[PDB]
Write a protein that binds this ligand. Structure first.
Ligand SMILES: [Fe+3]
Length: 133
């Protein structure tokens, strides 16, 4: 992750966007901070506060990280836009082209205590998007 962002800040940039433009455009807000294009990314059309509150849901096993049990599943399905890189051989980020796949699914996030640089408003924050169901 870019070092200037805490895990929660980077989670928000990658995964929270209420009205993202088409993927090829939306993904630039993420890839501009990287050396290479992301092969896949899901934007949950929600708010940071909302995800923080899902962190309050019962602790369950992370579907994509089965030795971890600090995951939390949303109670409701939420609108989202998934973006899949169409040209994975791209060497620069200005060439990244993405396919759009809108959907409405439950999401599962891993949450942990906040980084010292994070706001004190949220002592517990989402640190990675595990999967969507
Ligand atoms: Fe890579």
């Amino acid at each position: 992750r870019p070092p200037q962002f805490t895990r929660a800040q980077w989670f928000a940039i990658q995964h929270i966007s209420l009205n993202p433009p088409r993927c090829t455009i939306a993904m630039r807000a993420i890839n501009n901070y990287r050396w290479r294009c992301k092969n896949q990314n899901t934007f949950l059309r929600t708010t940071f506060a909302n995800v923080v509150n899902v962190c309050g849901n019962q602790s369950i096993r992370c579907p994509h990280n089965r030795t971890l049990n600090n995951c939390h599943r949303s109670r409701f399905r939420v609108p989202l836009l998934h973006c899949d890189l169409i040209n994975p051989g791209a060497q620069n980020i200005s060439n990244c082209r993405y396919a759009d796949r809108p959907g409405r699914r439950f999401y599962v996030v891993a949450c942990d205590n906040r980084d010292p640089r994070d706001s004190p408003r949220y002592p517990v924050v989402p640190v990675h998007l595990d999967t969507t169901i």
